[PDB]
Amino acid sequence: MSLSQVKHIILVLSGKGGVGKSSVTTQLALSLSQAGYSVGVLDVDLTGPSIPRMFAVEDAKVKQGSGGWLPVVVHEANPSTGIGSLRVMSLGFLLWRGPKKTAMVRQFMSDVLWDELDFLLVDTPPGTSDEHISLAETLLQEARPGQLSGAIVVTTPQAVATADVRKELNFCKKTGIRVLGVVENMSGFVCPNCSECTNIFSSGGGEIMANDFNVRFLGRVPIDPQFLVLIETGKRPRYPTPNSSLLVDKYRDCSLAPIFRAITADVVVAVEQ
Amino acid sequence: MSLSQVKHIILVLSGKGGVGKSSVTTQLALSLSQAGYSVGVLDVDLTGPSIPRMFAVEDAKVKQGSGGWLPVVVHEANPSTGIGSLRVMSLGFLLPWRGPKKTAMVRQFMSDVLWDELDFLLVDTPPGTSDEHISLAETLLQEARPGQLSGAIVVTTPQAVATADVRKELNFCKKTGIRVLGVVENMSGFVCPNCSECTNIFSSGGGEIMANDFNVRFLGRVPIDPQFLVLIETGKRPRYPSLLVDKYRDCSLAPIFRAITADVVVAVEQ
Ligand code: SF4
């Protein structure tokens, strides 16, 4: 009823919080919208960072249409510039309970008027806690055939033990979630004083991890502090609350944008078989 | 146990893993060594980065003395250089359990380490404040003489918005009666190889004011230097366009840890 015209649903996964998985979701969304797709982002990771905060709409009023909730507009579609619309909904609008809280969460998600949508990215909570696993089942239960394109697993090179990406991958295999690929966030550094991107500790090992699972490796994302500034203050990056509709335009000046453009283009060829 | 001649025991604490705690412990050890103190390091943090691997003694064969394990010598004292001996002992020396049994073995392992004469014993604890880890802290409190346990150093990250992490450590230190030597805000900024320019975009004093609001010492701010990692990994001296303790003198982090160490020493002996 709510997702009946959403073409592709992608879950953004993590075995542990603190990997910047909500940053990854934000930039996947912006990049897909820069490629001309209509993008939705559903945030059900109430522990992790606020996705509406990153889109500078954390103070927006969720409008109510006849029979549902209208997602918050980050920016409208723009044919002349070839960018698609971008809309967001947060579980924090609905919100200390047990199974009844799962039932309310499921009703709420089924109440969002997503309308036509090329891609709906889901910011899922980290880890496979019994509370989270049932929510993951809920999505699968309400998903329709062919719709769930699969999952994107976000990790870091820094993790000595990959038991959480091993865990999230194993859960995906166990439940049939297709793994579209793994993203290695915070692998290297881009900085303002000069554009040189460096990771002298190159072997983050996340790629061999992707080999061990015969699973796709979408690429490495460096830290760019000008991205965090852009999200926080709205300042456009330069290389030697903010207005939300300007974000996608300022993002193509961020050094991370060409990286996510390539990650996006490969995610799209994977989902479209 | 066998703390019979350990003058000062410092706990390095953390609300959660991945904050660079084991590396902070590593550099406190090197700095205390460069200041002429004999130093031991007890790694009881299995989930974190292997501290033996940091000191480049991960392939050592630990020996058995008089009813217990003998610590591995990273380097011995050198009065000429003014550096002191540096020993490490970790579980990763002896493993190629979960639940209460895991912590039982870890408590028994701690009991079985023969430390002998020592100015400072640094203890790399597992993060968090679970009841298991509390039991580890309680054991140390019992085997420690009234002046022996100097206090706890709490490592935190400015990027993390979970300040309460800090709080549950200093609440727990005050609940167990463990002095708080200070807070170290790690991963605060980033030094770069292409030029020694440190970049930091967080509050630039947010950890300072938060430690003031808690009435706890603020020991200082430590940025990320990837050349420290390549030195730990390949022995390459950090350049900024023999022994680890001496090569580390060329790492930008070393003057930072000289000042932090010095403040800790003043706090300890008063
Ligand atoms: S400008 Fe270049 S050399 Fe300076 S910190 Fe940034 S990356 Fe490093």
Write the layout of secondary structure elements.
2 copies of one chain form a homodimer.
Chain A: E1 6-13, H1 21-34, E2 39-43, H2 51-54, E3 64-65, E4 68-69, E5 72-75, E6 86-90, H3 99-109, E7 117-123, H4 130-142, E8 148-155, H5 163-175, E9 179-189, H6 206-212, E10 217-223, H7 225-233, H8 247-251, H9 256-271
Parallel strand pairs in A: 1-7, 1-8, 2-6, 2-7, 8-9, 9-10
Antiparallel strand pairs in A: 3-4, 5-6
Subcellular location (chain A): Cytoplasm
Binding site for ATP (chain A): 15-22
GO molecular function (chain A): 4 iron, 4 sulfur cluster binding; ATP binding; ATP-dependent FeS chaperone activity; metal ion binding
Q: Descriptors for this entry?
A:
homodimer; 273 residues; Rossmann fold; two-stranded antiparallel sheet; binds iron/sulfur cluster; YlxH/NBP35 (chain B); Cytosolic Fe-S cluster assembling factor cfd1-like protein (chain B); ATP-binding (chain B)
Describe this structure in words.
Two copies of one chain form a homodimer. In chain A, the strands form two sheets. In chain A, strands 5-6-2-7-1-8-9-10 form an eight-stranded mixed β-sheet, sandwiched between helices. In chain A, β3 and β4 form a beta hairpin. In chain A, α1 crosses α9. The first copy, chain A, is 34% helix and 22% strand. Chain A has one domain: P-loop containing nucleotide triphosphate hydrolases (Rossmann fold, 3-Layer(aba) Sandwich), CATH 3.40.50.300. By secondary structure, chain A is α/β, with parallel strands linked by helices. The radius of gyration of chain A is 18 Å and the shape is globular. Chain A contains nine helices and ten strands. The longest helix of chain A is centred in the last third of the chain and has 16 residues. Chains A and B meet through α7 of A and β8 and α7 of B. The structure holds iron/sulfur cluster. Iron/sulfur cluster sits at the interface of chains B and A. Iron/sulfur cluster (SF4) sits at the interface of chains B and A.
